[PDB]
Design a protein around this ligand. Structure first.
Ligand SMILES: [Mg+2]
Ligand SMILES: [Mg+2]
Ligand SMILES: [Mg+2]
Ligand SMILES: [Mg+2]
Ligand SMILES: [Mg+2]
Ligand SMILES: [Mg+2]
Ligand SMILES: [Mg+2]
Ligand SMILES: [Mg+2]
Ligand SMILES: [Mg+2]
Ligand SMILES: [Mg+2]
Ligand SMILES: [Mg+2]
Ligand SMILES: [Mg+2]
Ligand SMILES: [Mg+2]
Ligand SMILES: [Mg+2]
Ligand SMILES: [Mg+2]
Ligand SMILES: [Mg+2]
Ligand SMILES: [Mg+2]
Ligand SMILES: [Mg+2]
Ligand SMILES: [Mg+2]
Ligand SMILES: [Mg+2]
Ligand SMILES: [Mg+2]
Lengths: 260, 67, 131, 143, 188
RNA sequence: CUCCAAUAGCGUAUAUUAUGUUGCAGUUAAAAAGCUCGUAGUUGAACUUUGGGCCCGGUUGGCCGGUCGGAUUUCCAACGGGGCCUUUCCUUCUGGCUAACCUUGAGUCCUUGUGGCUCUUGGCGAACCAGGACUUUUACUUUGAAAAAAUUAGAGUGUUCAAAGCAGGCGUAUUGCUCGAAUAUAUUAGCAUGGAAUAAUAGAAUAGGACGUUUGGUUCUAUUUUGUUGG
RNA sequence: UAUCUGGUUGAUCCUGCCAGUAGUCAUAUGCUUGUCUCAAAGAUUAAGCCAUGCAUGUCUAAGUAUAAGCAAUUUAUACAGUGAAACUGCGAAUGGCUCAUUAAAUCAGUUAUCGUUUAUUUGAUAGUUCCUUUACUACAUGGUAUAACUGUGGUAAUUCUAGAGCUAAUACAUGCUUAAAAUCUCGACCCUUUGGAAGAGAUGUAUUUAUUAGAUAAAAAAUCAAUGUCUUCGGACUCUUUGAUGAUUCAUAAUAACUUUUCGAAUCGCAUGGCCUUGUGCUGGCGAUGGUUCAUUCAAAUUUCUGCCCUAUCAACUUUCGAUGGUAGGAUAGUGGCCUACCAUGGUUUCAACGGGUAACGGGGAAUAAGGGUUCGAUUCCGGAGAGGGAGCCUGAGAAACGGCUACCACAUCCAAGG
């Protein structure tokens, strides 16, 4: 309104951060970074809220400035850094590595991974082009730009990136039978396989996913991420595996988990 | 409420000049105290009355001529 | 600027102040359970109105509708837990019974008196509100 | 329309950056560019072979078709190279529970590769602002 | 000042709109350059973003390009001789795009007689080797020949010189030359 | 002085609240124009694939209940669904998933078994890939995606109750384990989709029509092969 | 309009009528007012006027310290801890407040940018810079001209400033170093060939124009050009690379030039390693800051389709002075009558245009409700607009900004009457 805004009033935050109303008047507004605004998670909503390591939003800064937390191998200090889908948050002390994946309610899970898995991440290509001096590049979903890819890589192929070197290691095409994790819209977090794909020259090509209990559903392609072949996935899925239970079965599960 | 009555109009002069222009155009399509009205009307009735009374008197004299 | 802390009123005035059956009923209630004003009775009748209408609006479903099964088991479980409903009468139909005295019997004041440690109703209210 | 005697106006007309070369002497005598509008519409033969010059024609010009594709009947063709079409719909008044006829005129650009008269049904497609009120090119002519 | 807003204009039914906001910066428009001929000067405006524009005023040479032969030479613009939009810019010699100017002929003739050795009008044995190796292409046209005999060629401007400060152009050849000769001399 | 009502609340004034789509009234007490013609508007008769035959099984209901309170096997009852065949384009072609067993070489676990299936020697054009080549257009109606959060309904939860809040619970409480923050709504437009009743629309009357291994050329576009790029 | 009370006569019944009888939830007001949890604060259609205070500034090890500032005492004689002032940088364009204007306008859902700008953040990215590139030109590193400070002052007065003397930079202004090839152009040569030949020049990036490539639907000859690998000297053309989208004159590359020549690190902190020929020789670590272009992100600006209250006793309107369109230019970040010149006569309208009224900011939403509906929404979230009224504009990525400037209308403060 003459320039970019800078505050974000809580109640206009993303609904999936689970920020309680009546605790203050504003919400952490993510800086500009790799991931978009509505579909990121700042590090202060992750360190403070989720893991309960901090109590304030000041002790978060005194964690980040001791050079402790690193997103994707590189050590980050901007306390509202937009962490996002498929990142690898390493905390050196506590010996922990997390990856940010969804879960079938739409949130962002606290999903610890092992060490040797914490050294790659997946990136869905978003464009391929000839760069400059005739050098091809790919542009993945987290803003990366990788020169010299394998010429069989086209738009919507999922690439597997080695965090240290930064180079592409591996890739996965986009075809039926591929395992798909859905990051966007109403089915946010469900895992199925592809069954079909509709053409629509002109806009918004749809995709018929089917999960592992035979419940098909349709999403736009924009919201589809490919994470491996049938059976075998490449990342490690969170618990519950993307099934989308239904609430009567959810309560039968909870109640039958009556252990004390 | 474009042509309202604002509270103070000396302190809104640039505004009312702009509104005068707006009205000029939009209704050039057609252009192409009431006690002062009551006072003017009564005055003009009075003047008409007195001129007629004068005329009446001159003619009644001229009718005295031809009795 | 903050988010609003919501609220809503728990009682509501009935149709008419006088309708002598209503005055006689409220006198029987507020004298038998040892109450204070008419707002206690109207608050309980507001609760029971809400319960009984939402249960009615369930009965205009059909059995094996997921919405009816889910919220019917929810409502029945709550009314069993409070004690208002029985243990054997656990169909959705029986909550279209449940007159006000069923609620006003689970009240802590009467429950003190019934346990025989209070010697009256009003003495029970006074033992309660004096810690 | 463009009305052959193509060099009618006070400046020479040519497709920009299309250069026919006087130091070669072929017979087709004017090198000519035409694109493919996309979306399954066909470049008509009068664009591939014709000699008009239009800079807002989707097949031989510098617009592109994207976004909404509309249809409607032509209602007047009295402007130069543009026309006005007319779309009708039924709008639902929910109190009365009924409908009512409504309509919108729309000015669209007709490239001179088409021959369009009044009463004629047409399918148009959206291009960038062509003039003050024009945002649409005729892309196929049906009836 | 000079704005590019469309909300002061009558709506397409012929209506008349009441304005709902003041002028904005992102709708401006500055002054025309009206860039005459002679003794270079250029003033650089700061546009949106940073973003220089070099508003030229009184420019006098240009990089004119001979399209058919495939070259370009920096020659000296000598006067606007026809303008399609507005016959006033002829009278006052104002360089806009599509102005029809007369340039110089002398770099071009020098180059041509260097490239082929043909002396437009009427020994170092390597040079004989090249010139005889390209003598089929030693053929221009009837008309451009006559212009070279005169001393100055017609040329169109194809660079906006109020926007980039450079008045480049190209040399008329072909049917465009016949059209502009007919127009220019059927005025006269 | 005696009652009555509401009660940490109670009174008075002013307003306002409990036109007709559903759903009003017009001889005699609101209101049918003096009369006919008439453009916009609303509205408009019937008719075009009906009917049969075969197979497949869903989801109920009954006989059932094998079980340590439902896992389900034989039947017919209805209810929805699909595929063939009955003159029934089911868009045409391009080398391919050849779709599919119309294709075939041998074998059989098991109630006597058309009650039950592993591998392949010309194959099947529709598996829709991508590709061409084109196709009457709507209204309606189902289903999907969409329509921020808070608000509203609503699941869980002893804020001591409650209004609320989205917290919390449980242990070896001596260095630690765990459940949550569901769900629905949202009407018109746009997008995608099954349906083809109802209501419009349009094709062959000067046949300027349709298919065609036909045979006149007029033409133009340029794939390949003549070194190679031009002709 | 139910319920309840009463009146309708000489009474009593039964009908009927009449009067009184109800929550509203909005404004104004009265009497009362102890405890716990909670949280609100508009209004004269006056978007009328404002005393005083405050609300926007900022420093790390890491741009500039000789404060004639403070503390030392530890290796610090260029400096070295801390550190006012001032230069530089960044921010002040967010937030907060209000609802005056505004009736296809805003706004709501839905599109588009193959029609553009983008500080920052994140990921990539830069061996080419002067020269006939040898008689040198700082690269162990170039030049002024100011602040604060000192000093002399003006005026009643203000966050007013003049004149003289110093000195800095990531201020400002300049300006070097390096691979190896390959490539074309001009070519001294000699010896005539079917021609080859030393050398010299250009090669990064950005800008501006002209041109070329960016293919693809399946046969073979005859034809010359011309012999290009092999020459098996005849000729076989044998093997021939090329991304994306629905779609491009796209991405990208190439040729000829152009430019008041853009960028291609003279900057800063901690460490002190290897070397080995011991020279203050050669290399070398973790960071900070800056930089070109491309992409991303936070945004912006335009934009597609449908949707507004009362009014016909408002029926024709727009078009001189842009109204609808065509061509060319100018202007803009960019499309566009956005403006200019010329030309055409169009555009909307009983399916209600145009013109009035609005105690009209739009939406999420609130209330009554059996429903259909009807009313309310300045007011906790989003979108617009405004900062007494009108008009301009500066700096900046971003403003037509008002706790920025400039003039005018209206108010109004100080005065030594000049400001
Ligand atoms: Mg703001
Ligand atoms: Mg698109
Ligand atoms: Mg009629
Ligand atoms: Mg009919
Ligand atoms: Mg106390
Ligand atoms: Mg109006
Ligand atoms: Mg109107
Ligand atoms: Mg960068
Ligand atoms: Mg000085
Ligand atoms: Mg280009
Ligand atoms: Mg233009
Ligand atoms: Mg004009
Ligand atoms: Mg309103
Ligand atoms: Mg208003
Ligand atoms: Mg509002
Ligand atoms: Mg403003
Ligand atoms: Mg004021
Ligand atoms: Mg700034
Ligand atoms: Mg201002
Ligand atoms: Mg202020
Ligand atoms: Mg402000």
């Amino acid at each position: 309104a003459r320039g970019p805004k800078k505050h974000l009033k809580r109640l206009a935050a993303p609904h999936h951060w689970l920020l309680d109303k009546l605790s203050g008047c504003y919400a952490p507004r993510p800086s500009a970074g790799p991931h978009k605004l509505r579909e990121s998670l700042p590090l202060i909503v992750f360190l403070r809220n989720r893991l309960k390591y901090a109590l304030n939003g000041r002790e978060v800064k005194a964690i980040l400035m001791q050079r402790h937390v690193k997103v994707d191998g590189k050590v980050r200090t901007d306390t509202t850094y937009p962490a996002g889908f498929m990142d690898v948050i390493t905390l050196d002390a506590t010996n922990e590595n997390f990856r940010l994946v969804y879960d079938v309610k739409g949130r962002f899970a606290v999903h610890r991974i092992t060490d040797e898995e914490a050294s790659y991440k997946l990136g869905k290509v978003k464009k391929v082009q000839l760069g400059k001096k005739g050098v091809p590049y790919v542009v993945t979903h987290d803003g990366r730009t990788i020169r010299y890819p394998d010429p069989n890589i086209k738009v919507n192929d999922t690439v597997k990136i080695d965090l240290a070197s930064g180079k592409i290691t591996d890739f996965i095409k986009f075809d039926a039978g591929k395992l798909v994790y859905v990051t966007g819209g109403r089915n946010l977090g469900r895992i199925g396989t592809i069954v079909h794909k509709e053409r629509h020259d002109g806009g918004f090509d749809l995709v018929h996913i089917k999960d592992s209990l035979d419940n098909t559903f349709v999403t736009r392609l924009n919201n589809v991420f490919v994470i491996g072949e049938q059976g075998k996935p490449y990342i490690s899925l969170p618990k519950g595996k993307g099934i989308k239970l239904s609430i009567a079965e959810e309560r039968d599960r909870r109640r039958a988990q009556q252990g004390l | 409420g474009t042509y309202r009555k604002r509270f103070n109009e000396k302190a809104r002069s640039g505004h009312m000049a702009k509104l005068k222009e707006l009205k000029r155009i939009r209704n050039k399509q057609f252009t192409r105290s009431k006690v002062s009205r009551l006072k003017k009307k009564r005055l003009d009735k009075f003047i008409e009355h007195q001129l007629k009374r004068e005329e009446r008197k001159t003619i009644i004299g001229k009718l005295q001529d031809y009795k | 600027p903050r988010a609003p802390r919501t609220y809503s009123k728990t009682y509501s005035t009935p149709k008419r102040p006088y309708e002598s059956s209503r005055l006689d009923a409220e006198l029987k209630l507020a004298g038998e359970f040892g109450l204070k004003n008419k707002k206690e009775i109207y608050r309980i009748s507001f609760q029971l109105s809400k319960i009984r209408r939402a249960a009615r609006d369930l009965l205009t479903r059909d059995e094996k509708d997921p919405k009816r099964l889910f919220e019917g088991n929810a409502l029945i479980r709550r009314l069993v837990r409070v004690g208002v409903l029985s243990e054997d009468k656990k169909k959705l139909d029986y909550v279209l019974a449940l007159k006000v005295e069923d609620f006003l019997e689970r009240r802590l004041q009467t429950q003190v008196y019934k346990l025989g440690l209070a010697k009256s109703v009003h003495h029970a209210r006074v033992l309660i509100t004096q810690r | 329309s463009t009305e052959l005697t193509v060099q009618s106006e006070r400046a020479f007309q040519k497709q920009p950056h299309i250069f026919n070369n006087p130091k070669v002497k072929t017979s087709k005598r004017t090198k000519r560019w035409y694109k493919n509008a996309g979306l399954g519409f066909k470049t008509p033969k009068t664009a591939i072979e014709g000699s008009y010059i239009d800079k807002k024609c989707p097949f031989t010009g510098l617009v592109s078709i994207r976004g909404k594709i509309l249809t409607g009947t032509v209602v007047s063709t009295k402007m130069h190279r543009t026309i006005v079409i007319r779309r009708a719909y039924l709008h639902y008044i929910p109190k009365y529970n009924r409908y009512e006829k409504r309509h919108k005129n729309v000015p669209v650009h007709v490239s001179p590769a088409f021959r369009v008269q009044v009463g004629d049904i047409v399918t148009v497609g959206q291009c960038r602002p062509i003039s003050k009120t024009v945002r649409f090119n005729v892309v196929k002519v049906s009836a | 000042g000079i704005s590019r807003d469309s909300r002061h204009k009558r709506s397409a039914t012929g209506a008349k709109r009441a304005q709902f906001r003041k002028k904005r910066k992102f709708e401006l428009g500055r002054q025309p350059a009206n860039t005459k001929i002679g003794a270079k000067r250029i003033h650089s405006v700061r546009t949106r973003g940073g973003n220089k524009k070099y508003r030229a005023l009184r420019i006098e040479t240009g990089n004119f390009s001979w399209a058919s032969e495939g070259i370009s030479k920096k020659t000296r613009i000598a006067g606007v001789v026809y303008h399609p939009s507005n016959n006033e810019l002829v009278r006052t010699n104002t360089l806009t795009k599509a102005a029809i100017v007369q340039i110089d002929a002398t770099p071009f003739r020098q180059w041509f007689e260097a490239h082929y050795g043909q002396t437009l009008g009427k020994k170092s044995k390597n040079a004989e080797r090249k010139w005889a190796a390209r003598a089929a292409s030693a053929k221009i046209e009837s008309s451009v020949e006559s212009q070279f005999s005169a001393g100055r060629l017609y040329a169109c401007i194809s660079s906006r010189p109020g926007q980039s400060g450079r008045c480049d152009g190209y040399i008329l050849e072909g049917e465009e030359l016949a059209f502009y000769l007919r127009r220019l001399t059927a005025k006269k």
